[PDB]
Design a binder for this molecule. Structure first.
Ligand SMILES: CC(C)(c1ccc(O)c(Cl)c1)c1ccc(O)c(Cl)c1
Ligand SMILES: CC(C)(c1ccc(O)c(Cl)c1)c1ccc(O)c(Cl)c1
Length: 267
């Protein structure tokens, strides 16, 4: 029941996802790992209290490495996972950038808007991709041979847990990535009218997809719930951006690609 234009729209989105999302994380290599063996700091202490996650490393030979993070005791041990998380966020950013650069609607935009759209949404599309590998039963993000296990009040798990409950299709996840990518009200966007029109289509296609393929009573209002997530994911964008900048101020860790996406000039 989709138009032919809507059908081709989903197929290009699925095609970009197919090409730029390494669901097995096979090419995530050479990453750093935790070492072996004033009112600011008190806020960064509270900030880093969500990164406390254990880390599992299953080798091809069958060996397994597990890391259990320390407990906060007023020192620098609270930064032990920052170098590794930065490498993973960077690998995730490269794939998100590759995702956008394949989409025709994205390439046709001016280069200054392409940069602005990526800067404003890169983190959101990363969270949407992580949710597809999130295991809500074990509280673990199964990233191929890597596993991030947790040691709902903290908004970005409430997001991940709720989004998994809706139990979406691959087509619905990638349509969400497009709506969040093509947000016309990011800082610095100039073709606001052109990007808003594109964003609308993506949203109307997602609405039509749900109504043609999901008649069950459990999926009543499903389109409106997704749009609520995206608004909620945008809020979690920005409150995590703040959190990032605060940790970076006292304890630098952001990679060059991260600095570029978060406006850090390096000076
Ligand atoms: C450094 C890291 C991974 C981080 C830092 C503290 C936290 O509590 C969590 Cl959950 C995650 C991060 C934070 C915000 C971002 O936008 C990006 Cl890309 C990366
Ligand atoms: C999905 C994951 C592993 C994550 C989140 C943001 C990132 O930038 C990276 Cl690299 C990885 C995560 C970790 C701790 C948390 O508290 C939550 Cl909500 C989510």
């Amino acid at each position: 029941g989709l138009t032919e234009e809507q059908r081709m729209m989903i197929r290009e989105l699925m095609d970009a996802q197919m090409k730029t999302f390494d669901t097995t994380f096979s090419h995530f290599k050479n990453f750093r790992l935790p070492g072996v063996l004033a009112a600011k700091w008190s806020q960064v202490r509270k900030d880093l209290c969500s990164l406390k996650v254990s880390l599992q490393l299953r080798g091809e030979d069958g060996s397994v490495w597990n890391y259990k993070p320390p407990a906060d005791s007023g020192g620098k041990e609270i930064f032990s996972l920052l170098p590794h998380m930065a490498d993973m966020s960077t690998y995730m950013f490269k794939g998100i950038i590759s995702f956008a650069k394949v989409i025709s609607y994205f390439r046709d935009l001016p280069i200054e808007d392409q940069i602005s759209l990526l800067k404003g949404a890169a983190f959101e599309l990363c969270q949407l991709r992580f949710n597809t590998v999130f295991n809500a039963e074990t509280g673990t993000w199964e990233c191929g041979r890597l596993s991030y296990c947790l040691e709902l009040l903290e908004p970005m798990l409430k997001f991940h847990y709720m989004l998994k409950k809706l139990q979406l299709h691959e087509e619905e996840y990638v349509l969400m990535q497009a709506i969040s990518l093509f947000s016309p009200d990011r800082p610095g966007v100039l073709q606001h009218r052109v990007v808003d029109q594109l964003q609308e289509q993506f949203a109307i296609t997602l609405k039509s997809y749900i109504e043609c393929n999901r008649p069950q009573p459990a999926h009543r209002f499903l389109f409106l719930k997704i749009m609520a997530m995206l608004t909620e994911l945008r809020s979690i964008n920005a409150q995590h951006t703040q959190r990032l900048l605060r940790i970076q101020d006292i304890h630098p860790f952001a990679t060059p690609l991260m600095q570029e996406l978060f406006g850090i000039t390096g000076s």
